[PDB]
Structure to design on (438 residues):
């Protein structure tokens, strides 16, 4: 049995989250239990609900029951979840899972879909060069960078010199600020002699905003 | 969670580790206990089902059992590749719900300590021309993965405008974090020196930048 | 295994 989730990457608070799981290689109305599970970033697994294929019986997390619907569709061989009145507390990776009722050595999981709940609107980042100081320039190597400030939503990718520069590159995970917007930095350490002879450009791509900036790092 | 498991467990390579899950007669007492291994945010892997059965393909270093209202996962011959989060899962008849434990993070001891490398960047001229100023403190290659970051302006504690990430693990098994001090043009110019102070394993590397 | 109990 294989499972594939689908759902929105980004949602606004108070909306209704709706998820579907396409099931293949077994019958949705066979002797299975079909579950939804979620994991908020950096937190534990949290089971949400189950629907049994044979009976149609459903059961729910006590703390989520008042806001969740779980359903199945035999013609579509799928099952689904609705969670209403979302808040940021519902930001999580949502997994569909399943198990035979009797052959419990089998365990099926989708790969999960990240759902981010935020009031923020899509915004491309401003890119600022992080130039080394000349005290760092007196060392043998120097750190050169680019700040990717105030974007939403994730993700952003950074490369250097169109991917031709890979050694000594470190791109850091983003911070989330009280404003709802992310920032991150990418640094590259290079020989300090190279600083007059080599051009350094960081290529920042934010596909949610259709924004792609190639920032030259001078001095 | 009505199931309690320790938040963390640690042992040396080769040792036997036990992870326990404590519940009630309504869940662990009468229902099937399962144990899952997970890297965070990705699908967990079933290690044990029906409280004491191992699925095909799982190493026989993993075993499980339960007794009364408690259940245990045992890992013999601990390897560094066993570092992961471990969850018990069980049905609760009285809640009519499936419950995961809060998770146990397994650390394999003995890995060599590594001090953080720290890089502090002042605001760019382009950001200052927008009347904003962001100091960027980048912290990498430290182990174990816990750090404390403090900002100082002319020797005094800055506690407005700082945002710091949690540590995250690099490709070389060490850790990385970053901290951001967001100011305006005027504040950045208001001070002699700014300092990023990174405390690790009891000791501190700080960094300074000046307008 | 996931989701499946013995006693309802």
């Amino acid at each position: 049995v294989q499972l594939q989730e689908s759902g929105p990457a980004v949602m606004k608070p108070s909306e209704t989250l709706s998820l579907t799981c396409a099931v293949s290689g077994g019958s949705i109305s066979g002797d299975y239990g079909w579950s939804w599970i979620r994991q908020a970033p950096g937190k534990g697994l949290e089971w949400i609900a189950i629907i049994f294929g044979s009976s149609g019986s459903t059961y729910y997390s006590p703390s989520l029951k008042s806001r969740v619907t779980i359903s199945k569709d035999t013609s579509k061989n799928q099952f689904s979840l609705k969670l209403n009145s979302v808040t940021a507390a519902d930001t999580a990776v949502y997994f569909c899972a399943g198990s035979p009722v009797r052959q419990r050595e089998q365990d099926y999981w989708g790969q999960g879909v990240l759902v981010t709940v935020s009031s923020a609107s899509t915004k491309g980042p401003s890119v600022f060069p992080l130039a080394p100081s000349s005290r760092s320039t007196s060392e043998s190597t120097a750190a050169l960078g680019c700040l990717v400030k105030d974007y939403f939503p994730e993700p952003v990718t950074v490369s250097w010199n169109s991917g031709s520069l890979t050694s000594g590159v470190h791109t850091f995970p983003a911070v989330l600020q009280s404003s709802g917007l992310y920032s991150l930095s990418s640094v590259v350490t290079v020989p300090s002699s190279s600083l007059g002879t080599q051009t350094y450009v960081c290529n920042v791509n934010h596909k949610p905003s259709n924004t792609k900036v190639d920032k030259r790092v001078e001095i | 969670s009505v199931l309690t498991q320790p938040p963390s467990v640690s042992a040396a390579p080769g040792q036997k580790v036990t992870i326990s899950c404590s519940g009630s007669s309504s869940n662990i007492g009468i229902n099937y206990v399962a144990w899952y291994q997970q890297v965070p945010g990705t699908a967990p892997k079933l290690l044990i089902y029906d409280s004491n059965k191992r699925p095909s393909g799982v190493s026989d270093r993993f075993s499980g059992s339960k007794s009364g209202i408690s259940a245990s996962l045992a890992i013999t011959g601990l390897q560094t590749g066993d570092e992961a989060d471990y969850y018990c899962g069980v049905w609760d008849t009285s809640l009519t719900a499936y419950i995961f434990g809060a998770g146990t993070r397994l650390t394999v001891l003995g890995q060599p300590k590594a001090a953080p490398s720290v890089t502090l960047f002042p605001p760019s001229s382009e950001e200052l021309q927008a009347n904003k100023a962001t100091l960027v403190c980048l912290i990498s290659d430290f182990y174990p993965g816990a750090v404390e970051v403090a900002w100082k302006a002319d020797g005094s504690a800055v506690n407005a405008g700082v945002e710091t990430t949690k540590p995250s693990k690099q490709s070389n098994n060490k850790y990385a974090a970053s901290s951001y001090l967001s100011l305006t043009s005027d504040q950045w110019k208001s001070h002699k020196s700014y300092s990023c102070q990174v405390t690790h394993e009891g000791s501190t590397v700080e960094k300074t930048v000046a307008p | 295994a996931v989701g499946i109990g013995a006693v309802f």
